[PDB]
Enzyme design. Structure first.
Site, PDB file in Angstrom:
ATOM      1  N   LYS A 127     -30.289  36.989  28.699  1.00  0.00           N
ATOM      2  CA  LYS A 127     -31.000  37.323  27.469  1.00  0.00           C
ATOM      3  C   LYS A 127     -30.277  36.763  26.252  1.00  0.00           C
ATOM      4  O   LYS A 127     -30.886  36.121  25.390  1.00  0.00           O
ATOM      5  CB  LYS A 127     -31.144  38.837  27.339  1.00  0.00           C
ATOM      6  CG  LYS A 127     -31.904  39.505  28.461  1.00  0.00           C
ATOM      7  CD  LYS A 127     -32.165  40.970  28.147  1.00  0.00           C
ATOM      8  CE  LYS A 127     -30.877  41.761  27.998  1.00  0.00           C
ATOM      9  NZ  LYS A 127     -30.023  41.667  29.205  1.00  0.00           N
TER      10      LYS A 127
ATOM     11  N   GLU B  21     -24.556  46.035  20.752  1.00  0.00           N
ATOM     12  CA  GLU B  21     -24.124  44.862  21.495  1.00  0.00           C
ATOM     13  C   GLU B  21     -22.643  44.611  21.253  1.00  0.00           C
ATOM     14  O   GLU B  21     -22.009  45.237  20.403  1.00  0.00           O
ATOM     15  CB  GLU B  21     -24.940  43.628  21.102  1.00  0.00           C
ATOM     16  CG  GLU B  21     -26.396  43.686  21.520  1.00  0.00           C
ATOM     17  CD  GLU B  21     -26.569  43.759  23.025  1.00  0.00           C
ATOM     18  OE1 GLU B  21     -26.237  44.807  23.616  1.00  0.00           O
ATOM     19  OE2 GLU B  21     -27.030  42.763  23.620  1.00  0.00           O
ATOM     20  N   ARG B  22     -22.098  43.675  22.023  1.00  0.00           N
ATOM     21  CA  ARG B  22     -20.676  43.386  21.947  1.00  0.00           C
ATOM     22  C   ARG B  22     -20.296  42.944  20.543  1.00  0.00           C
ATOM     23  O   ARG B  22     -21.007  42.164  19.902  1.00  0.00           O
ATOM     24  CB  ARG B  22     -20.306  42.303  22.956  1.00  0.00           C
ATOM     25  CG  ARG B  22     -20.636  42.659  24.386  1.00  0.00           C
ATOM     26  CD  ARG B  22     -20.201  41.575  25.341  1.00  0.00           C
ATOM     27  NE  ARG B  22     -20.601  41.876  26.708  1.00  0.00           N
ATOM     28  CZ  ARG B  22     -21.814  41.664  27.194  1.00  0.00           C
ATOM     29  NH1 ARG B  22     -22.779  41.152  26.448  1.00  0.00           N
ATOM     30  NH2 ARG B  22     -22.070  41.980  28.459  1.00  0.00           N
TER      31      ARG B  22
HETATM   32  N1  ATP Z   1     -29.191  29.282  30.648  1.00  0.00           N
HETATM   33  C1  ATP Z   1     -28.100  29.570  31.363  1.00  0.00           C
HETATM   34  N2  ATP Z   1     -27.470  28.567  32.012  1.00  0.00           N
HETATM   35  C2  ATP Z   1     -26.378  28.848  32.727  1.00  0.00           C
HETATM   36  N3  ATP Z   1     -25.779  30.027  32.911  1.00  0.00           N
HETATM   37  C3  ATP Z   1     -26.422  31.001  32.260  1.00  0.00           C
HETATM   38  C4  ATP Z   1     -27.561  30.865  31.483  1.00  0.00           C
HETATM   39  N4  ATP Z   1     -27.950  32.092  30.967  1.00  0.00           N
HETATM   40  C5  ATP Z   1     -27.054  32.924  31.435  1.00  0.00           C
HETATM   41  N5  ATP Z   1     -26.099  32.334  32.221  1.00  0.00           N
HETATM   42  C6  ATP Z   1     -24.963  32.982  32.861  1.00  0.00           C
HETATM   43  O1  ATP Z   1     -25.166  34.385  32.814  1.00  0.00           O
HETATM   44  C7  ATP Z   1     -24.108  35.015  32.062  1.00  0.00           C
HETATM   45  C8  ATP Z   1     -24.659  36.182  31.282  1.00  0.00           C
HETATM   46  O2  ATP Z   1     -25.579  35.700  30.282  1.00  0.00           O
HETATM   47  P1  ATP Z   1     -25.862  36.546  28.940  1.00  0.00           P
HETATM   48  O3  ATP Z   1     -24.658  36.645  28.093  1.00  0.00           O
HETATM   49  O4  ATP Z   1     -27.074  35.916  28.262  1.00  0.00           O
HETATM   50  O5  ATP Z   1     -26.321  37.979  29.457  1.00  0.00           O
HETATM   51  P2  ATP Z   1     -27.299  39.068  28.835  1.00  0.00           P
HETATM   52  O6  ATP Z   1     -28.696  38.855  29.258  1.00  0.00           O
HETATM   53  O7  ATP Z   1     -27.041  39.088  27.331  1.00  0.00           O
HETATM   54  O8  ATP Z   1     -26.701  40.419  29.424  1.00  0.00           O
HETATM   55  P3  ATP Z   1     -25.824  41.561  28.741  1.00  0.00           P
HETATM   56  O9  ATP Z   1     -25.855  41.225  27.248  1.00  0.00           O
HETATM   57  O10 ATP Z   1     -26.363  42.910  29.060  1.00  0.00           O
HETATM   58  O11 ATP Z   1     -24.407  41.327  29.272  1.00  0.00           O
HETATM   59  C9  ATP Z   1     -23.507  33.894  31.228  1.00  0.00           C
HETATM   60  O12 ATP Z   1     -22.154  34.171  30.886  1.00  0.00           O
HETATM   61  C10 ATP Z   1     -23.625  32.699  32.171  1.00  0.00           C
HETATM   62  O13 ATP Z   1     -22.562  32.684  33.117  1.00  0.00           O
HETATM   63 MG    MG Z   2     -26.189  40.042  25.788  1.00  0.00          MG
END
Ligand code: ATP
Ligand code: MG
Ligand code: ATP
Ligand code: ADP
Ligand code: MG
Ligand code: MG
Lengths: 487, 523, 166, 50, 46, 365
Positions: free
Chosen positions: F164, F190-191
């Site tokens: 996300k 969020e962080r």
């Molecule tokens: N488009 C992408 N290409 C490659 N790796 C990805 C991609 N999107 C996410 N990832 C991988 O997934 C991990 C988590 O992504 P992200 O920081 O967007 O999480 P999130 O959906 O914000 O979840 P949360 O905020 O609850 O931790 C990234 O650190 C990366 O390793």
């Molecule tokens: Mg996030």
């Protein structure tokens, strides 16, 4: 404090359909009926029924009408007894409500006696053993789960499987020629369905306005508040009890739907200070239903043949309400949605139905043997169906395919067009005799009709109709062959 | 000679969209389920509804408007009357709240009436054309009927109901106003923007002249969302009790229950299943029982209900969904898989049913529907378990069921009859829509000078009522009907399909693909 | 004379003479439907005479309402009215009703609907008023001379890729 | 206010024998005018902020 | 079989929890809405 | 004008978690009013409360925006004379704010022309827009199956560690930097490091010109913040966007991450307020809270707001009431699946469960 007739009280609390009443001279006995005499500008009278005693002066009650325009401290007068309903032959051909007031706009009813809706159920000594088959003119019911006169019948099913249709067919087949009287109780169902029933009964002359009618209708429907839906069944049952005892007649009692009685009591249970039980029903689910069901029985004085429709919420037969009703019946007809989706009507699952009179002592030996063979073949066919999906029809042995071919004909031969579902099906209904059904299935089991096409058994009556349909199928097939031949 | 109100107490507590009142000693008292006015200013009042009457004398109030202006200690006046809202032909084409207040765009009826009695109704025998072939054939709807529309999010639940309202515009313009179908569209808990888009959409087709909108947006308090269906049906009961027919659409009851749950829990009502109040079934039950078909003695008017319900992951085992299904006289199940599969409307015929039956179909549609039903039943089983006639025509019927706008009755019935009598056997499934488009919006016989029919032509829109009277299988119309279909089939196959099957060029192939897809969205 | 009874056995008012007079005093034929609505509300179901009077008002009325209504058609209204009478009221239209329809078709110039109504009268009724049959044929042949036998856009030649699918 | 209170008292038949008393209360919701309440009968002749 | 068994054992755990929470939320409401009245006793005698 | 309740004095009567009851002798102020605790209490930072309910004519229940540590009964509280107001205007561009509108960038004073309350009414029906157009993001799945609408509402439903946040940054880089209008970043639960990384990224890209004109405003109430702040930071950030939309007729981008924490925060306080929980344990007013917030996030006839909101699905249960209720408030829905990500496919969009409103030939080609 013996005679509480005319005793006065005041409304103390009003929450939804539950009302608390305060009496200075002492709360009347439970199940007592009260009238709201105060002029509140209401279009309909307000009546309450006491269900609980909070103290020596306060009593909790359920209203039978909407509690709109109800104020605190409003005056209330006891009626001196429980809710009373008219009884006797003067009620025949008439429509009533929970309170026993006619709603057919057909003039006053001459009532010579009234009886309370709440009564004690018959004791053990008042039980009569009547083991006689009831012929409903339906192949599946008459064969696998035959009905017993003076007994209790349940039609368990979801929504849209055909519970109401079967009841209509039973009325058309059992009530028109019934020697005694009939009572239909609509409980928490569609109002239009009651209207259609009333028109059909008038057309069938069951309700003869100019002549003599032989049925009563009691309607408490969805639109009504939960208080009415929780007592309409008692009212109709009281009428049937009078016909059973006083008139000594054999009466029919149709109920649709009995589940709404349980549902209505659950709705009010929360406001009565009762902790919900599992799923969310009231803790008194088993006891309340038991008291009502035990009243629906055949005694030494008369007999009541009861047919009740049970709604299985979300097709979950493990639900407390459907399950609790299984032990209060002599014959259970379980309908399945999958069967209906395959074009089979009535959508009965014979592997889940049961009957008490399915014993050689009561029914003929041939009838018992045929039914058991059918059940065994259907059970085996279902196990094979698992194989037929994994391996395929080719892998099955000679014996297995013969079971498959015969069983498929049994499945389609159980279907039957009803005389009341002509609009749904577009074909005339059939009334199959008990003997014809037994003989037709007996021949099918031993392979007397192995060469008949499978579809000839679909939506037909007796064996004769099967042969005629097969002949028609052959003729049309020949015509198609001739048309292809010319091309 | 003073406008003396009836003060009953003061405001004690406020919790969001609900409040509690303490009665002043020695005052008349307020009645249950009545409307009250909270004096937010010497000239401004906020509406509230009585919900609870406790032993302590405290009163539970559901606020409806001017909530932000409500403060503890304010005075409360009791009107002593139930909720009444404006009703009449003067409200059509307008957007209103459940309280009757009009919403600017860029007779009094009681909201708590009882449903018609058993002897005050009549059997459903008058059809209500949705405009979709699938529904009108396999799922008949009759005036005075409650037909649920159950499905998942983004499946066409709203579009189909709106199209049904629109499909009545053309009919109402021709026939007398006696048989015209008025529309009450009720939006509950929806976005304000969606209401505006719907309002513009209705206005474009001119449906506002026969339609009114009752909106209770998300920003509005739960009280309005709770009363919207009852106020909307009340506006529709005005026409029912005066020999006219109406159609009430509820979008959607799922969000009404949430509002009722919110109100009950805040007012200290014991929760039930999924935290819903115990009397949640009785809420919808008394709402949909008010939709009926009155008897000849009371006028013959009717109200048709199309409540909409949302499921999660095609789970119809939910609580409110089950309750509504056990109330309505039929259900239209929109399946997500079919919707993504290209089938639109995504009506799952197997899971959909209409308990009224053929009684809610015109004499012309009865014959076509009855035979069509058998073919599809066989078609479903044949494929589940060989170019047989049922399997040849079954696929073409399915292709004909794809639509984007409601279809005129004449165009739909004719196309179904053609596919029924094998006129489309030689037509490829991919080209069925193109065949239908030419049949409706064109006339091959006139184009090629081979039309000998006297009156029966698809451009004569007035033939719809003659068809609806005599049936297609009648000597008056049957002879010319077959001739037109025979000519259209022969001309179509000769001049179009032959060229279509002879296309190999990438440019031509792409052009054909665009044409056929467009034909889906045209007819 | 003989009391009529409704679906449920209740009696219905049969004195429908005053309502017919009201119908025969309307200016726009949409007002006639209002009279029918009032009749039904008063439990006075219309008879065959009432429907014929309504058809007469439709034929003799200038328009549906005081203000024009888009896509309004007298023929459609009358046919729908007949559909209600035969199907939802169980009353067979007589010769008078069909004659009014034929007159409207002739008056409006719709010569193709006249052919269909002509056969209907020749099938259910006993023939058609020969005055109206000849009038319809005259209208049809006028179209042939003027070329308005069919809408022109239909006669235009088209092709697989020459058709505009809106 | 006294005149209005007397008029309301006259209209009420139940309070025919009761003696009229006036009790003043300060309401910050009204900037001008006055209101009178008697046995639930409320008359408003006041205005607030515009 | 190992993926549908987990969903079955995960479902029964959730089903039990949801029910008991739901019962125990209708027990809190009944207790909360109810209250003890004025205590009529010889407070002075103490 | 001046409020009639400003300077009103009250005393703390009850303290439970972040919920505090205040008794005012002269009468409880209006709901949503802001109060400040005057007693020193040995605290390290000031204490502010927001009224949410009225227990009686004198007592009012409130939620604290800061921790309630070292808070005693009978503590003195003073009304501020109005709701919680935040700065608006071009003075806020290039700055970082908190729920209370105080700048936390350790830079010069904001010097805003005026302030506006966080709580406000949503646009009415007649003030709604009817413009549909495609916002090209550069991502194949979005631009093809679920195209986004300019001035519309977009939601990214996903679990934990699904992508996300990554997609939001990609959208910011591909849209916000090359955007004529203004942008507002609302961090909610969020962080804290992500905000710092975003701030550095916006400075390097010169979207924040510390010495020049900036196009971005940051409003951050993060996980560490108490529930009271996490339930109001979104309102404050939305208020700034509303001012740009209306008072200036300027196109705005509104990147909210994560909106689920807003509902979660209201759930935590609701438990303390003494309300009967709904299913799962959420507050009964879950739908109403979202409705009031989301309806304010819309494009009117004056300006346009394109909103992108991240939605967190707890336990990967998409049937949870919080994400489930949010579907109806979004023009575009982008559902992410953990299994797809585990297969090496990024982004993890599940096209079958995604949807868009402009998937209409009348709008797109
Ligand atoms: N488009 C992408 N290409 C490659 N790796 C990805 C991609 N999107 C996410 N990832 C991988 O997934 C991990 C988590 O992504 P992200 O920081 O967007 O999480 P999130 O959906 O914000 O979840 P949360 O905020 O609850 O931790 C990234 O650190 C990366 O390793
Ligand atoms: Mg996030
Ligand atoms: N018959 C149809 N053919 C093609 N597209 C359709 C059809 N009906 C609806 N759609 C489209 O499908 C999408 C969803 O339709 P609709 O708004 O009716 O859904 P819904 O059931 O109201 O869902 P929700 O209200 O939860 O968003 C829209 O883009 C709409 O234009
Ligand atoms: N014998 C039958 N033949 C065909 N369809 C039937 C039959 N019985 C029921 N149905 C189907 O079920 C509908 C009626 O359902 P109903 O009897 O009211 O069931 P329930 O009350 O259990 O929901 C019909 O409209 C039809 O679709
Ligand atoms: Mg039924
Ligand atoms: Mg919708």
């Amino acid at each position: 404090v013996a005679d509480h007739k005319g005793r006065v009280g005041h409304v103390s609390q009003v929450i939804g359909a539950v009302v608390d009443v305060h009496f200075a001279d002492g709360v009347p006995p439970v199940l007592t009926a009260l009238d709201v005499v105060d002029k509140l500008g209401r279009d309909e009278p307000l009546t309450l029924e006491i269900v609980q005693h909070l103290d020596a002066h306060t009593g909790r009650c359920i209203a039978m009408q909407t509690t709109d325009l109800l104020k605190l401290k409003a005056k209330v007068v006891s009626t001196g007894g429980n809710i009373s309903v008219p009884v006797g032959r003067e009620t025949l051909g008439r429509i009533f409500n929970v309170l026993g007031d006619a709603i057919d706009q057909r003039g006053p009813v001459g009532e010579k006696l009234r009886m309370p809706i709440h009564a004690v159920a018959p004791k053990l000594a008042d039980q009569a053993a009547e083991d006689a088959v009831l012929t409903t003119g339906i192949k599946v019911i008459d064969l696998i789960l035959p009905y017993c006169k003076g007994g209790k019948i349940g039609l368990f099913g979801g929504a849209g499987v055909g519970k109401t249709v079967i009841i209509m067919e039973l009325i058309n087949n059992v009530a028109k020629g019934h020697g005694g009287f009939s009572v239909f109780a609509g409980v928490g169902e569609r109002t239009r369905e009651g209207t259609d029933l009333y028109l059909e009964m008038m057309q069938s002359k069951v309700i003869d306005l100019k002549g003599e009618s032989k049925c009563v209708l009691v309607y408490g429907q969805m639109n009504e508040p939960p208080g009415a839906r929780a007592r309409v069944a008692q009212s109709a049952l009281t009428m049937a009890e009078y016909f059973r005892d006083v008139e000594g007649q054999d009466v029919l009692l149709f109920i649709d739907n009995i589940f709404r009685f349980t549902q209505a009591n659950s709705e009010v249970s929360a406001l009565l200070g009762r902790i919900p039980a599992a799923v969310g029903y009231q803790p008194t689910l088993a006891e309340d239903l038991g008291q009502l069901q035990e009243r629906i029985t055949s005694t030494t004085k008369g007999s009541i043949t009861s047919v009740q429709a049970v709604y299985v919420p979300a097709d979950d037969i493990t639900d407390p309400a459907p399950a609790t009703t299984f032990s209060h019946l002599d014959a259970t007809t379980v309908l399945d949605r999958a069967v209906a989706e395959s074009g089979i009507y009535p959508a009965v699952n014979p592997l889940e139905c049961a009957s008490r009179i399915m014993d050689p002592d009561v029914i003929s030996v041939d009838h018992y043997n045929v039914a058991q063979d059918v059940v065994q073949m259907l059970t085996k066919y279902r196990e094979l169906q698992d194989i037929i999906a994994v391996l395929g029809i080719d892998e099955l042995s000679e014996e297995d395919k013969l079971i498959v071919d015969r069983a498929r004909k049994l499945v389609k031969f159980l279907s039957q067009p009803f005389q009341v579902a002509e609009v749904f099906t577009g074909m005339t209904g059939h009334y199959v005799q008990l003997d014809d059904t037994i003989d037709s299935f007996s021949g099918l089991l031993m392979g007397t009709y192995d060469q008949v096409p499978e579809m000839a058994f679909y939506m037909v009556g007796g064996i004769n109709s099967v042969l005629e349909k097969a002949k028609k199928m052959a003729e049309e097939a020949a015509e198609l062959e001739k048309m292809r031949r010319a091309r | 000679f003073f406008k003396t109100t009836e003060m009953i107490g003061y405001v004690h507590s406020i919790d969001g969209t609900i409040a509690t009142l303490i009665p002043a000693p020695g005052n008349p008292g307020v009645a249950y389920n009545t409307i009250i006015q909270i004096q937010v200013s010497p000239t401004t009042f906020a509406a509230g509804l009585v919900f609870n009457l406790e032993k302590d004398g405290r009163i539970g109030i559901i606020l409806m408007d001017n909530i932000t202006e409500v403060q503890s200690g304010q005075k409360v006046m009791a009107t002593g009357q139930l909720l009444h809202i404006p009703v009449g032909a003067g409200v059509l084409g307008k957007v209103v709240n459940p309280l009757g207040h009009e919403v600017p765009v860029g007779t009094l009826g009681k909201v708590d009436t009882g449903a018609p009695n058993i002897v005050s109704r009549s059997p459903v025998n008058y059809n209500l054309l949705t405009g979709f072939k699938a529904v009108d054939t396999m799922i008949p709807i009759g005036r005075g009927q409650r037909e649920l529309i159950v499905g998942d999010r983004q499946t066409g639940k709203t579009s189909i109901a709106v199209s049904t309202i629109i499909n009545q515009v053309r009919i109402n313009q021709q026939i007398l106003s006696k048989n015209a179908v008025i529309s009450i569209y009720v939006s509950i808990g929806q976005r304000c923007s969606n209401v505006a888009r719907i309002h513009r959409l209705l206005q474009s087709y001119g449906a506002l002249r026969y339609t009114t909108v009752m909106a209770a947006t998300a920003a509005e308090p739960a009280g309005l969302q709770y009363l919207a269906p009852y106020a909307g049906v009340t506006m529709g009961e005005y026409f029912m009790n005066r020999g006219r027919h109406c159609l009430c659409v509820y979008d959607d009851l799922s969000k009404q229950a949430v509002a009722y749950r919110q109100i009950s829990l805040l007012l200290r009502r014991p929760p039930g299943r999924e935290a819903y109040p115990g009397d949640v079934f009785y809420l919808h039950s008394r709402l949909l029982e008010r939709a009926a078909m009155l008897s000849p003695g009371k006028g013959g008017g009717s109200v048709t209900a199309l409540p909409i319900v949302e499921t999660l992951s095609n789970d119809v085992t939910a609580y409110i969904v089950t309750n509504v299904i056990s109330i309505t006289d039929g259900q239209i199940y929109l399946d997500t898989k079919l919707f993504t599969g290209g089938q639109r409307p995504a009506v799952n015929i197997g899971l959909s049913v209409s308990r009224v039956g053929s009684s809610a179909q015109n004499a012309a549609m009865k014959g076509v529907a009855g035979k069509l039903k058998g073919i599809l039943a066989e078609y479903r089983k044949l494929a589940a378990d060989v170019q047989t006639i049922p399997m040849i025509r079954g696929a073409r019927f399915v292709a004909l069921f794809n639509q984007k706008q409601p279809s005129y009755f004449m165009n739909a019935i004719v196309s179904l009859y053609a596919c029924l009598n094998g006129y489309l056997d030689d037509v490829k499934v991919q080209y069925v829509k193109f065949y239908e488009y030419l049949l409706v919006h064109r006339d091959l016989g006139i184009m090629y000078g081979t039309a000998k029919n006297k009156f029966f032509y698809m451009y004569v829109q007035e033939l719809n009522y003659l068809i609806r009277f005599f049936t297609l299988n009648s000597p008056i119309l049957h002879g010319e009907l077959e001739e037109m279909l025979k000519q259209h089939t022969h001309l179509f196959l000769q001049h179009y399909q032959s060229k279509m099957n002879a296309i190999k060029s990438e440019k031509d192939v792409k052009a054909l693909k665009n044409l056929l897809y467009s034909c889906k969205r045209a007819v | 004379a003989a009391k009529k009874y409704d679906l449920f056995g209740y009696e219905v008012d049969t004195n429908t003479a005053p309502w017919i007079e009201k119908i025969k005093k309307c200016k726009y034929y949409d007002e006639a439907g209002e009279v029918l609505v009032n009749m039904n509300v008063s439990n006075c179901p219309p008879d065959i005479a009432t429907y014929n009077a309504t058809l007469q008002c439709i034929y003799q009325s200038p328009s549906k309402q005081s203000t024009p209504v888009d896509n309004e058609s007298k023929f459609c209204a009358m046919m729908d009215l007949l559909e209600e009478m035969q199907h939802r009221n169980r009353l067979k239209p007589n010769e008078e009703s069909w004659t009014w329809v034929m007159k409207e078709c002739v008056k409006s110039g719709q010569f193709r609907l006249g052919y269909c109504i002509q056969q209907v009268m020749e099938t259910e009724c006993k023939g058609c008023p020969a005055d109206l049959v000849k009038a319809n044929e005259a209208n049809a042949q006028k179209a042939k001379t003027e070329g308005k036998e069919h809408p022109g856009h239909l006669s235009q030649q088209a092709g697989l890729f020459d058709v505009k699918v809106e | 206010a006294r005149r209005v209170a007397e008029e309301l008292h006259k209209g009420l038949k139940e309070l025919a024998d009761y003696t009229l008393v006036l009790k003043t209360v300060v309401d910050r919701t009204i900037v001008k005018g006055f209101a009178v309440e008697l046995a639930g009968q409320y008359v408003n002749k006041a205005e607030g902020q515009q | 079989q190992q993926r549908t068994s987990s969903l079955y054992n995960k479902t029964r755990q959730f089903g039990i929890t949801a029910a008991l929470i739901e019962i125990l939320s209708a027990m809190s409401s009944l207790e909360g809405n109810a209250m003890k009245g004025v205590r009529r006793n010889k407070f002075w005698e103490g | 004008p001046v409020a009639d309740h400003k300077g009103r004095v009250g005393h703390v009567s009850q303290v439970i978690g972040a919920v505090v009851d205040v008794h005012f002798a002269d009468g409880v102020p209006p709901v949503l009013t802001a109060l400040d605790v005057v007693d020193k209490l040995g605290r390290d930072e000031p204490l502010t409360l927001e009224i949410v309910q009225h227990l009686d004519a004198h007592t009012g229940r409130c939620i604290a925006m800061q921790t309630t540590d070292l808070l005693k009964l009978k503590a003195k509280v003073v009304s501020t004379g109005g709701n919680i107001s935040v700065p608006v205007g071009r003075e806020t561009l290039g700055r970082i704010f908190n729920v209370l509108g105080d700048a936390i960038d350790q830079r010069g004073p904001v010097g805003e022309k005026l302030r506006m309350p966080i709580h406000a009414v949503a646009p009415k029906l007649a003030d709604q827009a009817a413009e549909d157009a495609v916002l090209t993001t550069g991502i194949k799945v979005i631009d093809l199956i679920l195209p986004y609408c300019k001035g519309g509402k977009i939601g990214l439903f996903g679990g934990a560690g699904v992508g996300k946040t990554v997609i939001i940054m990609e959208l910011i880089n591909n849209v916000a930097k090359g955007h004529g209008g203004f942008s507002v970043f609302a961090g909610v639960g969020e962080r804290t490091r992500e905000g710092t990384d975003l701030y550095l990224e916006m400075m390097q890209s010169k979207v924040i010109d510390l010495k020049g004109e900036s196009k971005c405003v940051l409003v951050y109430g993060q996980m560490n913040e108490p529930p009271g702040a996490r339930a109001r930071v979104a309102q404050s950030a939305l208020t700034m966007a509303e001012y740009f939309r209306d008072v200036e007729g300027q196109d705005v981008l509104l990147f909210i991450d994560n909106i689920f924490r807003f509902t979660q925060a209201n759930s935590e306080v609701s438990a303390l307020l003494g309300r009967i929980p709904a299913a799962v344990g959420y507050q009964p007013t879950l739908a109403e809270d979202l409705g009031q917030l989301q309806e304010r996030i819309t494009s009117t006839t004056k300006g346009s707001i394109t909103s992108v909101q991240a939605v967190y699905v707890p336990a990967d249960d998409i049937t949870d009431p919080a994400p489930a209720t949010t579907f109806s408030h979004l023009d575009a829905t982008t559902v992410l699946d953990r299994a797809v990500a585990e297969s090496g496919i990024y982004p993890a969009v599940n096209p079958l469960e995604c949807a868009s409103r402009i998937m209409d030939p009348d709008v797109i080609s």
